[PDB]
Design a protein around this ligand. Structure first.
Ligand SMILES: */C(=C\C(=O)Nc1ccc2ncnc(Nc3cccc(Br)c3)c2c1)CN(C)C
Length: 245
């Protein structure tokens, strides 16, 4: 027995793939004739969480199950960072993107939820470089969580630390040249990725706070949000552009 989020699949006109997908595809489409949407083919969580910086549920169906959402016209952030449009992104654009993800996650945090898979592949980009957390392999995963399954908001904070290296390197894979075993052994031994090229020390220190061994010493998303929003006045007021950041 359905709820009010439910729709008939007859209301959905699928168009383009985006797309597959381990558990299933992602399509661009139309809903009720007027409305451009995205449709994940093969949500309970997505019903209860409503925020500006989180991908917005529109509707759901049932086999074949559809999840219908607000459409993000610029695609996933990984691909945006890797692609044509940025080679020209600089630190102020990338820190503001960071601020927005932090804002969505400060919300997740306030609501006592956990994401579990926070990384640039799971951030979606829309018009005006708006970024939204979507879609609630260990290079992004906090040690206590990759090993003992201890997933909390503080393991999300760690992941956000890694997303920050994706931002500053235009979407390069973390721990370059290291296989998941070598990452896991080295991180346990207290290794952390070094300060990326041109990346200010104050931003890399922030990364290091997110990668504290002890989950409870990692900052909150609320602090992250506030630090990143205020960055260019309070932290780096003498920032000058460089070759890449
Ligand atoms: C980039 C992958 C990608 O996800 N493309 C993509 C573009 C636009 C878009 N808009 C809205 N929603 C999604 N995903 C979605 C649909 C339904 C439920 C959820 Br939760 C999320 C969407 C996806 C390719 N790269 C390899 C990651």
């Amino acid at each position: 027995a359905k709820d009010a989020w439910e729709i008939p699949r007859e209301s959905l006109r699928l168009e383009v793939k985006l797309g597959q997908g381990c558990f299933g595809e992602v399509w661009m489409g139309t809903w009720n004739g007027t409305t451009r949407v995205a449709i994940k083919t093969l949500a309970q969580v997505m019903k209860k969480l409503r925020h500006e910086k989180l991908v917005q549920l529109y509707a759901v169906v049932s086999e074949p199950i559809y999840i219908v959402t607000e459409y993000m016209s610029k695609g996933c952030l990984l691909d945006f960072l890797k692609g044509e449009m940025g080679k020209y992104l600089r630190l102020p654009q990338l820190v503001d993107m960071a601020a927005q993800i932090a804002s969505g996650m400060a919300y997740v945090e306030r609501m006592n939820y956990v994401h579990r898979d926070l990384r640039a592949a799971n951030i979606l980009v829309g018009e005006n470089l708006v970024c939204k957390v979507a879609d609630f392999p260990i290079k992004w995963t906090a040690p206590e969580a990759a090993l003992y399954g201890r997933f909390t908001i503080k393991s999300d904070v760690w992941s956000f630390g890694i997303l920050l290296t994706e931002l500053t390197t235009k979407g390069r894979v973390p721990y370059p040249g290291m296989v998941n075993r070598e990452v896991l052994d080295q991180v346990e031994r207290g290794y952390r990725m070094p300060c990326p090229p041109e990346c200010p020390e104050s931003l890399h220190d922030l990364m290091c706070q997110c990668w504290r061994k002890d989950p409870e010493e990692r900052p909150t998303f609320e602090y992250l949000q506030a630090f990143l929003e205020d960055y260019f006045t309070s932290t780096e007021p003498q920032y000058q552009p460089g070759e890449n950041l």
